[PDB]
A paper describes a structure:
In this paper, we present a strategy to fuse specific, high-affinity protein binders to obtain multivalent or multispecific scaffolds of predetermined geometry. DARPins are used as building blocks to confer the desired specificity to the construct. A series of rigid connector modules replacing the [name] capping repeats allow to combine the individual [name] domains in such a way that their distance and angle can be altered to test different geometries, bringing the binding partners of the DARPins into a defined spatial arrangement. The two helices are not just joined end-to-end, but instead the two domains are made to overlap in such a way that the joining helix is stabilized by contacts with the domain cores along its entire length.
In the context of [name]-β-lactamase fusions, we observed that the paratope of this [name] has a high propensity to form major crystal contacts, leading to crystal formation under a wide variety of conditions. Indeed, constructs D12_Hxx_D12 with H02, H09, H11, H13 and H15 yielded diffraction-quality crystals in space groups P212121, P6122, P212121, C2 and P1, respectively, at resolutions ranging from 1.8 Å to 3.5 Å. Only three of the D12 constructs did not rely on paratope-paratope interactions, but instead relied on paratope-capping repeat or paratope-connector module interactions as dominant crystal contacts: D12_H11_D12, D12_H13_D12 and D12_H12_D12_H12_D12 (P21). The propensity of [name] D12 to engage in crystal contacts is so large that, where the crystal geometry does not allow for its preferred interaction, alternative interaction geometries are observed. These are found as paratope-paratope interactions, interactions with the [name] N- and C-caps, with connector modules or with the target protein of a second [name] in the construct.
Author numbering: 13 to 325
């Protein structure tokens, strides 16, 4: 009984009635049929006073409704700047995501709330956070014509963009420069390729050594599960395969299809890479979607020379 009253006194904005109910023992973390709590409703309707009293009585600042929305999601959706700052001040998760990977920044940027975008960024909101549909806040702001927000997130991405371009084009002095200026060495592009993915793909050995030297993730996956070692075994750059394994590259890393670096080394006839992978404990028993082992793939592509090595094991 008290639960329902508190929930509707928050929705309705009745400050005095919320005080009375909480003093009579009403549960501050009460939840309705879909998981909305009093703090959810006060944030949606924009009742700053109530928000502050509920948190003051031990209200869960990161409660999740049935869909995964938190009070911060709702404040950023409706554009209530003052309430956003209160929620973060009380320990609200700035990078919380609902069931389709939506963060507060996605919503602020989509509904065109410049000030909230800025406050969310100031508290560590991920600039390139991708939702369930591959969309960042910058994408959502572009598609909705929120010009100022687009230009702000584009600026907030530029440094990480130039590192990715530098690593792809093979410009070592630019890679070094942008790392020295705070570039996130593990940033990702539109498909999950990190600078290390792109240097291995293009065969830029020098830059692969520099990236690992500055704490690049050697076993990073893109959106399809490919690690850097995967790409180096496909393209057939032996020296990059050697550098990755020296830094703990998962030799038996499997992508979304189960394919491992040894599958591609045999499929595209790269004898030298096969040896090094087996030296580091590459399992030949592993299969994949098609159910084929690295030995089967060596015969299909007319490469019996590599197949004879696998037989011996």
């Amino acid at each position: 009984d008290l639960g329902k009253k508190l929930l509707e006194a928050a929705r309705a904005g009745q400050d005095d009635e919320v005080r009375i109910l909480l003093a009579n023992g009403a549960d501050v973390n009460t939840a309705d049929e879909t998981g909305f709590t009093p703090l959810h409703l006060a944030a949606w309707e924009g009742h700053l006073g109530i928000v502050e009293v509920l948190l003051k009585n031990g209200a869960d600042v990161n409660a999740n409704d049935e869909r995964g929305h938190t009070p911060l999601h709702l404040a950023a959706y409706t554009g209530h700047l003052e309430i956003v700052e209160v929620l973060l001040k009380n320990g609200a998760g700035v990078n919380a995501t609902d069931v389709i990977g939506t963060a507060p920044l996605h919503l602020a940027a989509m509904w065109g709330h410049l000030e909230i975008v800025e406050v969310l960024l100031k508290n560590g909101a991920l600039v390139k956070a991708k939702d369930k549909f591959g969309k960042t806040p910058k994408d959502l702001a572009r598609d909705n014509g929120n010009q100022f927000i687009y230009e702000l997130l584009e600026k907030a991405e530029l440094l990480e963009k130039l590192l990715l371009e530098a690593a792809r084009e093979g410009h070592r002095d630019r890679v070094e420069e942008f790392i020295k200026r705070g570039a996130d060495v593990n940033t990702a592009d539109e498909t999950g390729f990190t600078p290390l993915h792109l240097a291995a793909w293009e065969g830029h050995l020098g830059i692969v050594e520099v990236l690992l030297k500055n704490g690049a993730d050697v076993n990073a996956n893109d959106e399809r599960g490919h690690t850097p070692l995967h790409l180096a075994a496909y393209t057939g750059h032996l020296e990059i395969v050697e550098v990755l394994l020296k830094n703990g590259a998962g030799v038996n890393a499997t992508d979304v299809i189960g394919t491992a670096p040894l599958h591609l080394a045999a499929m595209w006839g790269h004898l030298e890479i096969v040896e090094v992978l087996l030296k580091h404990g590459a399992d030949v028993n592993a299969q994949d979607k098609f159910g084929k082992t690295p030995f089967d793939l060596a015969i299909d592509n007319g490469n019996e020379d590599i197949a004879e090595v696998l037989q011996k094991a």
